[PDB]
Amino acid sequence: KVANEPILAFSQGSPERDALQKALKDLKGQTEAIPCVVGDEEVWTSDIQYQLSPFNHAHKVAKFCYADKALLNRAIDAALAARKEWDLKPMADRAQVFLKAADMLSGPRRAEVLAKTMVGQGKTVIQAEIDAAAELIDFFRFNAKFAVELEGEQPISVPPSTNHTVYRGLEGFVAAISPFNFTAIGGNLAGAPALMGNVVLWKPSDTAMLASYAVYRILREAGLPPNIIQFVPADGPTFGDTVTSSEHLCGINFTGSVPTFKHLWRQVAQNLDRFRTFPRLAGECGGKNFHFVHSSADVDSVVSGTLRSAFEYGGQKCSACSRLYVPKSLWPQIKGRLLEEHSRIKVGDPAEDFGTFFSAVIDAKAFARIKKWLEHARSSPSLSILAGGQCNESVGYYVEPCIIESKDPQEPIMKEEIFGPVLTVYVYPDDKYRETLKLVDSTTSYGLTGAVFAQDKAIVQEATRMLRNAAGNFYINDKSTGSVVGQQPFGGARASGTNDKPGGPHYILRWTSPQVIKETHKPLGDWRYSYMQ
Amino acid sequence: HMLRWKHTSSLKVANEPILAFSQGSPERDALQKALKDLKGQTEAIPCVVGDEEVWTSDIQYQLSPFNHAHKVAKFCYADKALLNRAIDAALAARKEWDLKPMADRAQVFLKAADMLSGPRRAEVLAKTMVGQGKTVIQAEIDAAAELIDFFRFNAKFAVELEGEQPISVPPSTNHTVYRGLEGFVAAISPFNFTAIGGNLAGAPALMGNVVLWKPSDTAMLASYAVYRILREAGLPPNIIQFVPADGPTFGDTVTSSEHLCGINFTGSVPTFKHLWRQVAQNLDRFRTFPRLAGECGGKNFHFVHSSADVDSVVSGTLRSAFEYGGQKCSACSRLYVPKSLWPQIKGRLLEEHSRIKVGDPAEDFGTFFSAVIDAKAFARIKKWLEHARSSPSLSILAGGQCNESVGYYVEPCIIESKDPQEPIMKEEIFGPVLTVYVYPDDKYRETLKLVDSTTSYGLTGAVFAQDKAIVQEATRMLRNAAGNFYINDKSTGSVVGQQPFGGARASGTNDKPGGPHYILRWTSPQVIKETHKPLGDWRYSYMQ
């Protein structure tokens, strides 16, 4: 029996707000030296790297290093040697490690992981809370529940035989490759397979190293044995090349770009004759998510839900709204309100100013990519910047929220994932709402999240049918971000990935390869059959 | 609430009872009639796209394995044009089929299951016997029982899956929609089980997919029979396209389509790997990432401990190794026996061997097993028998002869190897060829390690022992050597809902058809959240 972790309010004078402020002060001016961890060994290579605070890049929040091919190969060997015993452990015993970790994250370690996510990844208080605390805690508690309950899914036994399913971990090691934008995803990508009796090489994101290592240490402290999860930061291509070259690879649990996932998929395919078994690839690959508005919509909900979806955490979510479809009849209201609220958004230091709505984007490369899109918006004949458009990387990687109108529903900016605070609006004629729904479905290569805002039941039913494959997480009168474990299992198809729905009950099935054992309790008869006589 | 979700139902099903076919029984008379109905007959089996029967110039024949002069079916290979037309038409039918309630789709399969159970039982058994060379009881466990069980149990699993729903908290309602995959699925089925073709095409269809089904050439007669029953049970046009084809041609075409969303495959490891590689080559062309499911071969073991019941070892091993001529991915091909029990076991095996009758399964119900499937299989097995004769490490204990003048007939053959790593202990033969290795009792632990490490496969295996500690030890040691592991029973004959079937290592992706989770591979869920109250401000209270 598990329920969702409460989201704290962080009111003035509250225990959690005081605790968080202390944790933030604990990180001010600090650099943690974070080693690779193989078993219990802390290992340093000469390939030194730094994680910078996105809103103050002079602050090196961590120094770490890239594992080389040799170190990665040692990590593989060490993990494989620990796998059999771990896999033989009762599911309940493995679950206990994650349940203990969840309690630590909920209580004594909450402030630490929130603060490290804020300072290291640039999240505001609430974005860190829903991620590093609530989502991570929920992943650990719900997956533990799902896994313990899965053992109860057993086949039919008929006398004189007894049948039993053993939920084996996969034979080999799993490579877990996590993204910068959610601390919780790292914990799940490495943790879910480990829960199911796998051993894991975890390559955490360079730009989330501080919080990722915090989670790692908590798992170890909660009782995770050595060599079950190896903590191995590495150059992306080097890590991919190394794990896909190992005969013992049995899975890749990936969250990141489509091209990188496709590359790994192709590397595994090139090497099929080397592997002991067919590796399982799981990929969560982003989107180009929509909010579609019908003329019956509640304007205030459209405005607030769209501002949040598009701009929270600087739009750096695979689920963020980046294309808004508005009927002509409502445009003067929605335009006016978006622009007015836009001027009230505070972009700044989220540790020093809790008034901040969102902060700097993650790193120099993200800043550069997003700037290219703002430059495009200034160039394109079909695009007009209505608000925002500024950026400044002198102190932090700061990009202002930007609202653009496109006259072309199929402009590249309507199609390509930017991962920045950049919202494009297309205004459609009221009487062409159906043709426009078709455009929502056909315009992009993605299928992740989408929302419809409408107060007309027939419209909602029609839109729901038409957009069936345009979004794997579909929202009626709510924003396209903020899936909650156990409530909105998350994922989509088309180019958005393999859709294994982490956050729901079936995800863990990807990380078990069941064995069925039949025991017969009476001696066998003759080999002949009666009809043969 | 603007979206209304209907309550979900449940379904009660049980395994299809195996019939006895005793003398004078209605089922025995019915089967004999159905067999006579096929004597001297050749069915012309077209490709079917929608409701159109299509012929191409690439005419092919299916032969009766025990009487290859008998062409049981004339069929044709779909060309690339027809395959692509089949894809287009399937795609145009998909949205409607996907939107149909799960319960309505399930009803087609429940109707088909009942037809197979009753009025069509004799037909599908007879066609499996005559076309694939099965004996009465092998046809019965396959074309009737397993296929019927697949249809009924998958229907239950699918209807009940819709009841697995997420938590809702005010002010919102959450619902999971179990969407079929967007695109088409290619189903590629093997000669050796009629039921497998039905499941490979049928399970994805049940889940709201559309399918191009390429049946096995050497099982065409029974396969088309199943296809027709599905259509008669109410399967709409263009949901399953019946498209026999050249294997490479079929794979090239389906892997070249932007709309491929899955391959459901049972067959050889190299072919599965090839398809996997073709999909990887075409990744940038697809609308979504295709899901590949592969059930491949085995090199399966029976391991005997000194505490084993000798008669159970002999009975279960003869059946596992030799039923259907050992042409099962699950068949025992390696037997490990302790020195202490070898005199008893060898004596019994050799005696019982001499009592095994090989012959025409239609004309003589006394037949234990019949001819192997085709000329290619016969040639391969012949080469292995020749290897047994020439290899210094091998000794033929019984059988060893073969004759293809009338049917593809091979004697059951028992070989002893002095080398536990001989090639014959490693490579899948798919013929009635059992190899025995005798180990010293005091080396049982080391030998268990060999059982685990000797082959590339991980499909089925059995341990015969009455010592509980030994059973526990072996169970732990062999955990990954068999996806279907048996204690004091034979390594073949998994039953739907009782022993979900499949294994890893080189044996495939292990999606466990026969169990409750298999259908999850053929759905891509969507979660809908409906919020029933206006949203608040975009700011949060803590920002004040």
Short mmCIF file of N, CA and C in Angstrom, two decimals, chain A residues 9 17 87-88 124-126 155-156 163 166-168 171 262 265-266 269-270 272-273 276-277 280 301 304 307-308 312 341 354-355 454 457 461 468-469 471-478 486-489 494 498-499 501 506 509 513-518 520 523-529 531-532, chain B residues 2-3 20-21 28 98-99 135-137 166-167 174 178-179 182 273 276-277 280-281 283-284 287-288 290-291 312 315 319 323 352 355 365-366 368 479-480 482-489 497-500 505 509-510 512 517 520 524-529 531 534-540 542-543:
data_model
loop_
_atom_site.label_atom_id
_atom_site.label_comp_id
_atom_site.label_asym_id
_atom_site.label_seq_id
_atom_site.Cartn_x
_atom_site.Cartn_y
_atom_site.Cartn_z
N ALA A 9 4.18 23.20 0.56
CA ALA A 9 3.78 24.54 0.15
C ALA A 9 4.89 25.58 0.34
N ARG A 17 10.62 25.32 4.32
CA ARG A 17 11.25 26.52 3.77
C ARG A 17 12.52 26.90 4.55
N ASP A 87 20.06 -10.80 -7.91
CA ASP A 87 18.89 -11.33 -8.61
C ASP A 87 18.20 -12.42 -7.79
N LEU A 88 18.99 -13.21 -7.04
CA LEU A 88 18.42 -14.25 -6.18
C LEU A 88 17.75 -13.73 -4.91
N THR A 124 13.69 26.31 -9.73
CA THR A 124 13.08 27.03 -8.62
C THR A 124 12.64 26.05 -7.55
N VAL A 125 12.24 26.58 -6.40
CA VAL A 125 11.80 25.75 -5.28
C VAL A 125 10.77 24.70 -5.69
N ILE A 126 9.68 25.13 -6.32
CA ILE A 126 8.60 24.19 -6.62
C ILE A 126 8.99 23.18 -7.71
N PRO A 155 0.69 -18.34 -12.56
CA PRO A 155 -0.17 -19.08 -13.49
C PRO A 155 -1.07 -20.09 -12.80
N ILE A 156 -1.89 -20.76 -13.60
CA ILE A 156 -2.77 -21.82 -13.13
C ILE A 156 -1.98 -23.10 -12.87
N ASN A 163 2.74 -24.83 -10.90
CA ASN A 163 3.43 -23.90 -11.78
C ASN A 163 3.73 -22.58 -11.08
N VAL A 166 8.95 -17.10 -11.93
CA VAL A 166 10.07 -16.42 -11.29
C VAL A 166 10.41 -15.21 -12.13
N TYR A 167 10.30 -14.02 -11.55
CA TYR A 167 10.59 -12.81 -12.30
C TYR A 167 12.08 -12.48 -12.24
N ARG A 168 12.84 -13.15 -13.11
CA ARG A 168 14.29 -12.98 -13.20
C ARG A 168 14.65 -11.59 -13.69
N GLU A 171 19.74 -11.07 -17.83
CA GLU A 171 21.09 -11.61 -17.68
C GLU A 171 22.10 -10.74 -18.42
N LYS A 262 18.50 6.72 -31.61
CA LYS A 262 18.60 6.00 -32.88
C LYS A 262 20.01 5.47 -33.12
N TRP A 265 20.51 2.46 -30.91
CA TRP A 265 19.72 1.39 -31.50
C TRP A 265 20.50 0.76 -32.65
N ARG A 266 21.09 1.60 -33.49
CA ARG A 266 21.87 1.10 -34.62
C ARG A 266 23.17 0.43 -34.19
N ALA A 269 22.23 -2.99 -33.08
CA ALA A 269 21.92 -3.82 -34.24
C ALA A 269 23.20 -4.28 -34.96
N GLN A 270 24.18 -3.39 -35.07
CA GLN A 270 25.43 -3.74 -35.74
C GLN A 270 26.13 -4.87 -35.00
N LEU A 272 24.73 -7.39 -33.02
CA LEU A 272 23.86 -8.47 -32.55
C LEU A 272 24.57 -9.81 -32.38
N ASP A 273 25.54 -10.10 -33.24
CA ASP A 273 26.19 -11.41 -33.18
C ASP A 273 27.15 -11.53 -32.01
N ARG A 276 25.10 -12.01 -25.80
CA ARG A 276 24.59 -13.28 -25.28
C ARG A 276 23.07 -13.35 -25.41
N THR A 277 22.40 -12.21 -25.31
CA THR A 277 20.97 -12.15 -25.58
C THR A 277 20.63 -10.83 -26.24
N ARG A 280 17.40 -5.10 -24.62
CA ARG A 280 16.15 -4.36 -24.61
C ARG A 280 16.41 -2.87 -24.55
N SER A 301 -7.89 29.81 -17.57
CA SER A 301 -7.19 28.53 -17.49
C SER A 301 -6.22 28.35 -18.66
N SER A 304 -3.10 30.78 -17.73
CA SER A 304 -2.21 30.30 -16.68
C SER A 304 -1.59 28.93 -17.00
N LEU A 307 1.09 29.54 -19.77
CA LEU A 307 2.29 30.16 -19.20
C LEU A 307 3.12 29.15 -18.40
N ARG A 308 2.47 28.35 -17.56
CA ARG A 308 3.21 27.34 -16.82
C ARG A 308 3.82 26.29 -17.73
N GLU A 312 7.72 27.15 -17.29
CA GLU A 312 8.31 26.58 -16.08
C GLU A 312 9.59 25.82 -16.43
N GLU A 341 0.62 39.22 -18.54
CA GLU A 341 1.23 38.32 -17.56
C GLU A 341 2.74 38.15 -17.82
N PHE A 354 13.05 33.80 -4.10
CA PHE A 354 11.96 32.84 -4.29
C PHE A 354 10.80 33.43 -5.09
N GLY A 355 10.89 34.70 -5.44
CA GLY A 355 9.90 35.32 -6.31
C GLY A 355 10.09 34.92 -7.77
N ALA A 454 -11.57 23.34 -23.69
CA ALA A 454 -12.92 23.48 -24.24
C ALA A 454 -13.94 23.14 -23.17
N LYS A 457 -18.90 19.55 -24.56
CA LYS A 457 -18.66 18.11 -24.49
C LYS A 457 -18.47 17.45 -25.86
N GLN A 461 -15.14 15.36 -27.07
CA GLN A 461 -15.19 13.99 -27.55
C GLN A 461 -14.60 13.87 -28.95
N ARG A 468 -6.03 11.05 -30.86
CA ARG A 468 -5.70 9.78 -30.21
C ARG A 468 -4.23 9.39 -30.26
N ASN A 469 -3.57 9.64 -31.40
CA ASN A 469 -2.17 9.26 -31.54
C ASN A 469 -1.23 10.46 -31.59
N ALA A 471 -0.79 12.40 -28.93
CA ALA A 471 -0.28 12.60 -27.57
C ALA A 471 -0.49 11.33 -26.75
N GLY A 472 0.57 10.85 -26.12
CA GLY A 472 0.45 9.71 -25.23
C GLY A 472 0.03 10.15 -23.84
N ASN A 473 0.25 11.43 -23.53
CA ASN A 473 -0.33 12.02 -22.33
C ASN A 473 -1.18 13.19 -22.79
N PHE A 474 -2.49 13.01 -22.69
CA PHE A 474 -3.46 13.93 -23.29
C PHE A 474 -4.26 14.57 -22.17
N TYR A 475 -4.47 15.88 -22.27
CA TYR A 475 -5.05 16.64 -21.17
C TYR A 475 -6.27 17.41 -21.64
N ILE A 476 -7.34 17.32 -20.86
CA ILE A 476 -8.53 18.11 -21.11
C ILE A 476 -8.66 19.17 -20.02
N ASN A 477 -8.57 20.44 -20.42
CA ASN A 477 -8.62 21.57 -19.49
C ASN A 477 -7.55 21.52 -18.40
N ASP A 478 -6.36 21.07 -18.78
CA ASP A 478 -5.20 21.17 -17.91
C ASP A 478 -3.96 21.32 -18.76
N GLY A 486 1.72 7.22 -10.95
CA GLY A 486 0.54 6.50 -10.50
C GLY A 486 -0.77 7.13 -10.93
N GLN A 487 -0.68 8.34 -11.46
CA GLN A 487 -1.87 9.10 -11.87
C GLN A 487 -1.86 9.34 -13.37
N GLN A 488 -0.74 9.83 -13.90
CA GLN A 488 -0.54 9.95 -15.34
C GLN A 488 0.78 9.29 -15.73
N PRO A 489 0.78 7.96 -15.87
CA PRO A 489 1.97 7.27 -16.39
C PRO A 489 2.40 7.97 -17.67
N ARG A 494 5.04 7.71 -31.73
CA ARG A 494 5.66 8.42 -32.87
C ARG A 494 7.16 8.59 -32.59
N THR A 498 9.76 4.82 -27.13
CA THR A 498 9.20 3.47 -27.13
C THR A 498 7.95 3.34 -26.27
N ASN A 499 7.62 4.40 -25.53
CA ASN A 499 6.41 4.45 -24.71
C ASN A 499 6.24 3.30 -23.72
N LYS A 501 5.86 3.77 -20.57
CA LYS A 501 5.04 4.31 -19.48
C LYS A 501 5.60 4.15 -18.07
N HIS A 506 3.16 -1.18 -15.60
CA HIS A 506 3.72 -2.11 -16.57
C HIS A 506 5.20 -1.88 -16.90
N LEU A 509 8.01 -4.40 -16.22
CA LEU A 509 8.03 -5.62 -17.04
C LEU A 509 9.15 -5.60 -18.09
N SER A 513 12.83 -10.83 -17.18
CA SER A 513 12.68 -11.86 -18.20
C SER A 513 12.18 -13.10 -17.47
N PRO A 514 10.86 -13.31 -17.45
CA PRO A 514 10.29 -14.34 -16.57
C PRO A 514 10.70 -15.77 -16.92
N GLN A 515 10.86 -16.58 -15.88
CA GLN A 515 11.02 -18.01 -16.01
C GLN A 515 9.78 -18.66 -15.40
N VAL A 516 9.24 -19.67 -16.07
CA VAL A 516 8.15 -20.45 -15.48
C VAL A 516 8.66 -21.83 -15.10
N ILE A 517 8.41 -22.21 -13.86
CA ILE A 517 8.86 -23.49 -13.34
C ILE A 517 7.64 -24.38 -13.11
N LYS A 518 7.64 -25.55 -13.74
CA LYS A 518 6.58 -26.54 -13.52
C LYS A 518 7.16 -27.71 -12.77
N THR A 520 6.18 -31.42 -11.23
CA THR A 520 5.20 -32.49 -11.29
C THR A 520 5.47 -33.46 -10.15
N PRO A 523 4.96 -39.65 -10.46
CA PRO A 523 5.79 -40.24 -11.52
C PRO A 523 5.07 -40.19 -12.86
N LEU A 524 5.82 -40.07 -13.95
CA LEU A 524 5.21 -40.01 -15.27
C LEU A 524 4.74 -41.40 -15.70
N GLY A 525 3.71 -41.44 -16.54
CA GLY A 525 3.20 -42.71 -17.04
C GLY A 525 4.01 -43.25 -18.19
N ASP A 526 3.38 -44.07 -19.02
CA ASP A 526 4.03 -44.61 -20.21
C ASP A 526 4.14 -43.52 -21.27
N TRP A 527 5.07 -43.69 -22.21
CA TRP A 527 5.27 -42.71 -23.27
C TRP A 527 4.20 -42.83 -24.36
N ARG A 528 3.57 -44.00 -24.43
CA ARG A 528 2.51 -44.24 -25.40
C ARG A 528 1.23 -43.54 -24.96
N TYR A 529 0.28 -43.41 -25.89
CA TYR A 529 -1.01 -42.82 -25.58
C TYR A 529 -2.10 -43.86 -25.81
N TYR A 531 -4.96 -43.84 -27.32
CA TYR A 531 -5.57 -43.91 -28.64
C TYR A 531 -4.70 -44.72 -29.61
N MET A 532 -3.43 -44.93 -29.26
CA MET A 532 -2.52 -45.67 -30.12
C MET A 532 -2.74 -47.17 -30.04
N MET B 2 -16.78 15.50 -19.05
CA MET B 2 -17.10 15.45 -20.47
C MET B 2 -16.75 14.11 -21.09
N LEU B 3 -15.77 13.42 -20.51
CA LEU B 3 -15.49 12.05 -20.91
C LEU B 3 -16.11 11.07 -19.92
N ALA B 20 -9.74 -37.81 -26.11
CA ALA B 20 -9.07 -39.11 -25.98
C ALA B 20 -8.96 -39.89 -27.29
N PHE B 21 -9.91 -39.69 -28.19
CA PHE B 21 -9.91 -40.37 -29.48
C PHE B 21 -9.89 -41.88 -29.31
N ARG B 28 -13.05 -39.49 -32.74
CA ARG B 28 -12.22 -40.37 -33.57
C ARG B 28 -12.88 -40.61 -34.93
N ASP B 98 -9.26 -0.12 -34.28
CA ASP B 98 -8.68 0.31 -33.01
C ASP B 98 -9.74 0.95 -32.09
N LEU B 99 -10.67 1.70 -32.68
CA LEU B 99 -11.70 2.39 -31.90
C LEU B 99 -12.82 1.46 -31.41
N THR B 135 0.85 -36.53 -35.60
CA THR B 135 -0.03 -37.62 -35.19
C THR B 135 -1.28 -37.02 -34.57
N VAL B 136 -2.29 -37.85 -34.36
CA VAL B 136 -3.53 -37.39 -33.75
C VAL B 136 -3.28 -36.53 -32.52
N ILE B 137 -2.52 -37.05 -31.57
CA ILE B 137 -2.39 -36.34 -30.31
C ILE B 137 -1.57 -35.07 -30.44
N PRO B 166 -5.27 4.08 -13.61
CA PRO B 166 -4.49 4.87 -12.65
C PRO B 166 -5.36 5.49 -11.56
N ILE B 167 -4.70 6.09 -10.58
CA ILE B 167 -5.35 6.82 -9.50
C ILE B 167 -5.83 8.18 -9.98
N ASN B 174 -8.34 10.48 -14.28
CA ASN B 174 -7.34 9.87 -15.14
C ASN B 174 -7.81 8.53 -15.69
N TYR B 178 -6.01 1.83 -23.98
CA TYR B 178 -5.07 0.86 -24.50
C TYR B 178 -5.14 0.84 -26.03
N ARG B 179 -4.46 1.81 -26.64
CA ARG B 179 -4.42 1.98 -28.10
C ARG B 179 -3.69 0.84 -28.77
N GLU B 182 0.23 2.30 -33.87
CA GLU B 182 -0.09 3.09 -35.05
C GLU B 182 0.78 2.62 -36.19
N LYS B 273 17.61 -11.92 -36.54
CA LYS B 273 18.66 -10.91 -36.47
C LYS B 273 18.66 -10.06 -37.73
N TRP B 276 15.85 -7.59 -37.58
CA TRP B 276 16.24 -6.60 -36.58
C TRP B 276 17.18 -5.59 -37.22
N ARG B 277 18.14 -6.08 -37.99
CA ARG B 277 19.08 -5.19 -38.66
C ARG B 277 18.41 -4.35 -39.76
N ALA B 280 16.70 -1.49 -38.10
CA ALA B 280 17.68 -0.49 -37.68
C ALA B 280 18.17 0.35 -38.86
N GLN B 281 18.36 -0.29 -40.01
CA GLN B 281 18.79 0.41 -41.21
C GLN B 281 17.75 1.46 -41.64
N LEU B 283 15.52 3.09 -39.73
CA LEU B 283 14.98 3.82 -38.58
C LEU B 283 14.48 5.22 -38.91
N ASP B 284 15.17 5.91 -39.81
CA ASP B 284 14.81 7.29 -40.09
C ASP B 284 13.56 7.41 -40.96
N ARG B 287 7.49 6.06 -38.87
CA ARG B 287 6.76 7.03 -38.06
C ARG B 287 6.98 6.78 -36.57
N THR B 288 7.14 5.51 -36.19
CA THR B 288 7.50 5.21 -34.80
C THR B 288 8.44 4.02 -34.75
N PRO B 290 9.57 0.52 -34.33
CA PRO B 290 8.90 -0.78 -34.42
C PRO B 290 9.27 -1.69 -33.25
N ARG B 291 8.33 -2.53 -32.85
CA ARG B 291 8.54 -3.47 -31.76
C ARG B 291 8.74 -4.84 -32.36
N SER B 312 10.29 -42.37 -15.02
CA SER B 312 9.90 -41.02 -15.41
C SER B 312 10.92 -40.39 -16.35
N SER B 315 10.43 -42.28 -19.86
CA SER B 315 9.17 -41.89 -20.48
C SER B 315 9.20 -40.45 -20.97
N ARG B 319 9.46 -38.98 -25.00
CA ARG B 319 8.44 -38.08 -25.51
C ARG B 319 9.05 -36.76 -25.93
N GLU B 323 8.68 -36.95 -29.91
CA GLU B 323 7.35 -36.56 -30.38
C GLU B 323 7.47 -35.52 -31.49
N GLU B 352 12.68 -49.58 -24.97
CA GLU B 352 11.54 -48.77 -25.41
C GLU B 352 11.75 -48.25 -26.83
N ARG B 355 10.39 -50.24 -29.59
CA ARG B 355 8.93 -50.30 -29.64
C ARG B 355 8.30 -49.05 -30.27
N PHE B 365 -3.00 -45.09 -36.57
CA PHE B 365 -2.99 -44.34 -35.31
C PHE B 365 -2.04 -44.93 -34.28
N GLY B 366 -1.42 -46.07 -34.61
CA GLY B 366 -0.41 -46.67 -33.75
C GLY B 366 0.93 -45.97 -33.87
N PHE B 368 3.88 -43.53 -33.47
CA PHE B 368 4.33 -42.64 -32.41
C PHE B 368 4.69 -41.27 -32.99
N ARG B 479 19.05 -21.19 -13.50
CA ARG B 479 18.07 -20.09 -13.58
C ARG B 479 17.97 -19.44 -14.95
N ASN B 480 19.11 -19.24 -15.61
CA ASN B 480 19.10 -18.64 -16.93
C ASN B 480 19.38 -19.58 -18.10
N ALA B 482 17.17 -21.94 -18.84
CA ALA B 482 15.85 -22.30 -19.35
C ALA B 482 14.78 -21.32 -18.90
N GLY B 483 14.04 -20.79 -19.87
CA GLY B 483 12.92 -19.91 -19.58
C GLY B 483 11.70 -20.71 -19.17
N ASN B 484 11.66 -21.97 -19.60
CA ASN B 484 10.66 -22.92 -19.13
C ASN B 484 11.39 -24.10 -18.52
N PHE B 485 11.34 -24.20 -17.20
CA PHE B 485 12.15 -25.15 -16.45
C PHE B 485 11.21 -26.16 -15.81
N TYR B 486 11.59 -27.43 -15.88
CA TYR B 486 10.71 -28.50 -15.45
C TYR B 486 11.37 -29.36 -14.39
N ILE B 487 10.62 -29.64 -13.33
CA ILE B 487 11.09 -30.54 -12.27
C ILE B 487 10.29 -31.83 -12.34
N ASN B 488 10.98 -32.92 -12.67
CA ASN B 488 10.34 -34.22 -12.84
C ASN B 488 9.20 -34.25 -13.87
N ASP B 489 9.38 -33.52 -14.96
CA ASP B 489 8.48 -33.63 -16.11
C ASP B 489 9.29 -33.33 -17.36
N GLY B 497 -1.61 -20.45 -20.12
CA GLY B 497 -2.16 -20.08 -18.84
C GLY B 497 -1.56 -20.86 -17.68
N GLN B 498 -0.79 -21.89 -18.01
CA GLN B 498 -0.16 -22.75 -17.01
C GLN B 498 1.37 -22.66 -17.09
N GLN B 499 1.92 -22.83 -18.29
CA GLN B 499 3.34 -22.57 -18.50
C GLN B 499 3.53 -21.60 -19.66
N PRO B 500 3.37 -20.29 -19.38
CA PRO B 500 3.70 -19.27 -20.38
C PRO B 500 5.07 -19.60 -20.97
N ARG B 505 18.60 -15.68 -23.66
CA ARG B 505 19.84 -15.98 -24.39
C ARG B 505 19.55 -15.92 -25.89
N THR B 509 13.26 -12.99 -27.51
CA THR B 509 13.02 -11.80 -26.70
C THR B 509 12.23 -12.12 -25.42
N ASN B 510 11.73 -13.35 -25.34
CA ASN B 510 11.00 -13.86 -24.17
C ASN B 510 9.79 -13.03 -23.71
N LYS B 512 6.82 -14.20 -23.52
CA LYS B 512 5.92 -15.11 -22.82
C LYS B 512 4.48 -15.18 -23.34
N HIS B 517 1.00 -11.15 -19.82
CA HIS B 517 1.72 -9.91 -20.16
C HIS B 517 2.02 -9.78 -21.65
N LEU B 520 0.72 -6.97 -23.83
CA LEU B 520 1.21 -5.62 -23.58
C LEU B 520 2.18 -5.16 -24.66
N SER B 524 0.01 0.44 -27.17
CA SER B 524 0.79 1.62 -26.80
C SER B 524 -0.16 2.52 -26.03
N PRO B 525 -0.14 2.45 -24.69
CA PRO B 525 -1.19 3.14 -23.93
C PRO B 525 -1.12 4.66 -24.01
N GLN B 526 -2.29 5.28 -23.96
CA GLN B 526 -2.40 6.73 -23.82
C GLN B 526 -3.07 6.97 -22.48
N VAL B 527 -2.63 7.99 -21.76
CA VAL B 527 -3.31 8.35 -20.53
C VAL B 527 -3.97 9.71 -20.71
N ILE B 528 -5.25 9.78 -20.41
CA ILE B 528 -6.03 11.01 -20.50
C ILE B 528 -6.32 11.56 -19.11
N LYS B 529 -5.97 12.82 -18.86
CA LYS B 529 -6.36 13.49 -17.62
C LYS B 529 -7.37 14.57 -17.93
N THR B 531 -9.47 17.61 -16.20
CA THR B 531 -9.56 18.43 -15.00
C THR B 531 -10.89 19.17 -14.99
N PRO B 534 -11.58 25.16 -12.93
CA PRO B 534 -10.70 26.13 -13.58
C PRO B 534 -9.33 26.12 -12.92
N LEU B 535 -8.29 26.40 -13.70
CA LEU B 535 -6.96 26.45 -13.13
C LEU B 535 -6.83 27.75 -12.35
N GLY B 536 -5.82 27.84 -11.51
CA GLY B 536 -5.64 29.04 -10.73
C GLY B 536 -4.71 30.00 -11.43
N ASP B 537 -4.01 30.80 -10.64
CA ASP B 537 -2.97 31.67 -11.16
C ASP B 537 -1.79 30.82 -11.62
N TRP B 538 -0.89 31.42 -12.38
CA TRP B 538 0.33 30.72 -12.78
C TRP B 538 1.38 30.76 -11.67
N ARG B 539 1.29 31.77 -10.82
CA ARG B 539 2.18 31.90 -9.67
C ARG B 539 1.85 30.86 -8.60
N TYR B 540 2.79 30.64 -7.69
CA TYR B 540 2.61 29.75 -6.55
C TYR B 540 2.66 30.57 -5.27
N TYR B 542 4.22 30.23 -2.52
CA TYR B 542 5.54 30.41 -1.92
C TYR B 542 6.32 31.59 -2.54
N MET B 543 5.90 32.05 -3.71
CA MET B 543 6.59 33.14 -4.41
C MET B 543 6.22 34.52 -3.88
#
